[PDB]
């Protein structure tokens with residue numbers, strides 16, 4: 196079978212806390228003796244439209260930040276700002292702090308989101324960083340500070356923290372250094388993204404997964420050159436496929452005996468002809484939020 | 496709308512591995528009991544048609560290797576309940592959540608924590624199909640992985656994984672060891688009944704579309720429940736039960752559209768098709784979001 200699968204979220208759940216300043220409440224990430232959260236928690240209504248964050252932050256005291264881990268209040272003993280994230284230093288270390296690191300992911304890469312409200316985890320799902328640096332998340336009011344992550348062995352690699360929804364309903368945020376993905380800004384304004392494109396190497400991975408699970412109606416007898424495929428792919432607002440992408444698809448190619456450029460010829464036919472009512476792995480649309488690695492691990 | 500799983504940490508803290516000879520699967524460690532599929536006691540060649548009672552009579556506590564990670568939990572008692580093994584262990588799980596064992600209905604959804612050798616690998620959302628299979632993602636060694644829902648702080652355990660069918664869907668039991676559907680834990684070819692579309696969930700999905708301002712498909716007609724069920728079966732949709740009508744209640748109230756009026760709108764979509772339009776960015780009607788799922792993501 197094949198499902199959109201998230202990493203188990205327990206190691207991240209034990210880091211989540213609630214952070215309040217004024218009448219604003221969102222989530223923080225508690226690692227060792229530091230809590231990370233979106234800086235716009237210091238903003239009032241009158242601040243949110245053009246917040247001069249350095250100016251607003253210097254006027255705040257440690258005691259203006261109310262941090263709660265379940266029943267317990269954590270005492271803030273210092274605060275600083277790193278780009279769009281606030282670092283609240285606390286007098287107590289999180290014992291549940293896992294082995295972790297902070298990474299900035301590339302567009303087309305995937306990661307799990309642990310959506311939280313008032314510091315309590317509510318759900319977990321899988322996302323990709325879109326080529327236009329938005330994410331198609333499920334985030335309501337109160338979800339800021341929810342984080343996205345990958346787990347390699349015993350290590351949690353944090354790659355996203357949530358800050359906002361765009362008018363189109365997609366979402367935008369930062370890495371754990373507080374740098375936004377994309378051309379967005381932590382002010383209360385309607386912001387449009389650049390035109391999105393489809394993550395081709397991931398569509399190809401998913402087609403291979405469909406074959407591994409017995410679905411093959413979209414295959415064809417034809418091949419294509421890499422450049423002629425890319426010409427068609429760009430026409431349809433699909434990302435170009437690089438030779439590194441081709442190399443990454445090798446394992447999936449070997450396992451199934453379908454040359455990458457044969458699968459590209461299939462995808463080209465799907466783009467030109469559409470799906471003619473049919474479905475692949477349940478979907479009526481071509482899915483682009485599985486990486487080759489995602490498909491490999493899940494299918495062995 | 497995403498498929499969203501429950502946070503899995505409370506269940507991760509309960510996963511262990513259980514080994515008999517070379518056969519290793521997963522178990523669920525709550526208080527001082529470990530729950531797992533009984534077929535752990537079967538050699539690969541025993542699985543063709545096992546005599547579970549006779550295989551268990553030859554077993555002693557000291558034939559069972561239970562491990563949390565690499566740490567052995569000594570087994571101090573054992574009993575078979577339907578198709579699961581209960582192994583009493585000498586340590587109460589310090590991470591035991593508040594929990595319940597529940598038997599769910601077809602159509603209901605739940606999160607699966609896929610595990611191998613006692614270690615969680617992934618979590619995803621499943622629906623229990625009307626033919627009592629699930630469209631899971633499971634490899635060798637996944638048995639004893641569990642499906643669950645979390646209400647407030649209480650984990651309601653509803654599924655334990657035992658097997659894959661010829662069509663590549665999956666079958667298992669509740670935590671009392673009773674299979675969902677007409678399957679047995681024997682390495683024999685078995686067939687699921689023909690599957691049907693989960694009508695209550697499709698209706699939930701239509702409510703979700705209305706809540707988001709997508710309401711072209713609403714019409715001025717209504718229907719009886721019986722007339723709707725008889726029409727729906729002709730399109731291989733499940734009949735609605737009284738419980739289905741009940742769990743659509745909150746979405747009915749939220750939108751002010753009576754359940755039976757939404758049924759009349761769906762009947763017209765069945766009878767006339769989408770005429771080329773979409774609902775919620777899709778020509779397909781989705782059937783694996785329950786009314787609870789719709790609430791979790793809209794409000």
Ligand SMILES: *[C@H](O)[C@H](C[C@@H]1CCNC1=O)NC(=O)[C@H](CC(C)C)NC(=O)OC[C@@H]1CCC(=O)N1CCc1ccccc1
Pocket residue numbers: 221235238243334335336337338339340358359360361362366380381382383384385386
């Ligand atoms: C933090 O919890 C919250 C998360 C948001 C809330 C809705 N969904 C989410 O993911 N973040 C915020 O509220 C942002 C705070 C800023 C960065 C100071 N703002 C935000 O997400 O605004 C969302 C709304 C939805 C529609 C839209 O365009 N905007 C932007 C603000 C706005 C401008 C003009 C008109 C209406 C809204």
Ligand SMILES: *[C@H](O)[C@H](C[C@@H]1CCNC1=O)NC(=O)[C@H](CC(C)C)NC(=O)OC[C@@H]1CCC(=O)N1CCc1ccccc1
Pocket residue numbers: 520534542633634635636637638639657658659660661665679680681682683684685
């Ligand atoms: C337990 O980890 C394992 C999980 C399986 C492994 C592959 N995917 C899964 O979900 N369960 C088992 O191996 C089952 C043990 C029995 C119930 C004692 N058996 C099982 O899953 O058999 C699967 C195979 C795949 C093809 C097929 O038809 N079957 C069923 C039995 C069978 C019939 C005919 C020919 C070969 C096997």
